[PDB]
Ligand binder design. Structure first.
Ligand SMILES: [Zn+2]
Ligand SMILES: [Zn+2]
Length: 237
């Protein structure tokens, strides 16, 4: 509930950006706060304010700050694919992710340090977020399957390589091989057995952290596994 805001400073003697956001006009950022809250990577979500480093914040659900769910979704997508689940953990990626989050909350960049490689970093993030909307060709379908008999289901949308986890009820085995979902169900399987193919396996509730009038900080956890799913109608006979 009550959490201290920690930081790691990114300072290379470089003006990272010259930006404007709300009342804050033509502000030069010559260092960057990489925020942590209780071990977890956080982002500033009010680009016109300074954060209260070292102070006790109160955690509340992200919806207290932002009503619009599509925005809340997008902010968690950018956090997730941009940095937390990204292969590149560099200071530059963190900054790019923070900067992209800030673009959605009204920040405008007049100057950007060329060494960020910002446009290329941003583009790869938006591609990852857009691809996460795509679902398998068998998404939401019901398919009959006899107990014992191994079934194969082809995803003609070419999305199964993005699957990070598989949930199945007891008595159902489900594996991925290329664009094929390989399935077998036994007598312990329920009559309608749903397989979930998750894109995200570190799902949680996104929190906003507030200390006084200082900058609000988000632990922007994705709250949806973004699964393609398929329901098997298990034939007992
Ligand atoms: Zn320094
Ligand atoms: Zn400074």
């Amino acid at each position: 509930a009550q959490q201290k805001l920690d930081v790691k400073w990114i300072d290379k003697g470089i003006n990272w950006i010259v930006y404007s956001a709300k009342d804050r006009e033509n502000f030069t950022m010559d260092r960057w706060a990489k925020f942590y809250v209780n071990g977890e990577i956080a982002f500033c979500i009010e680009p016109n304010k300074e954060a209260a480093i070292g102070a006790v914040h109160t955690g509340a659900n992200l919806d207290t700050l932002f009503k619009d769910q599509a925005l809340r979704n997008k902010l968690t997508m950018i956090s997730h694919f941009g940095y937390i689940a990204n292969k590149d953990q560099s200071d530059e990626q963190y900054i790019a992710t923070q900067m992209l989050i800030w673009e959605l909350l009204g920040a405008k960049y007049h100057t950007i340090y060329n060494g960020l490689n910002y446009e290329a970093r941003k583009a790869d993030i938006l591609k990852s977020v857009k691809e996460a909307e795509q679902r398998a060709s068998f998404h939401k379908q019901k398919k009959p399957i006899k107990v014992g008999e191994k079934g194969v289901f082809v995803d003609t949308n070419n999305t199964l390589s993005n699957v990070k986890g598989i949930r199945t009820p007891s008595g159902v085995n489900a594996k991925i091989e290329g664009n094929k979902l390989i399935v077998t169900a036994d007598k312990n399987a329920p009559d309608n057995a749903t397989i979930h193919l998750d894109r995200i396996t570190i799902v949680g509730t996104p929190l906003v952290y507030t200390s006084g009038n200082a900058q609000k900080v988000g632990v922007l956890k994705p709250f949806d596994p973004l699964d393609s799913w398929l329901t098997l109608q298990v034939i007992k006979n």
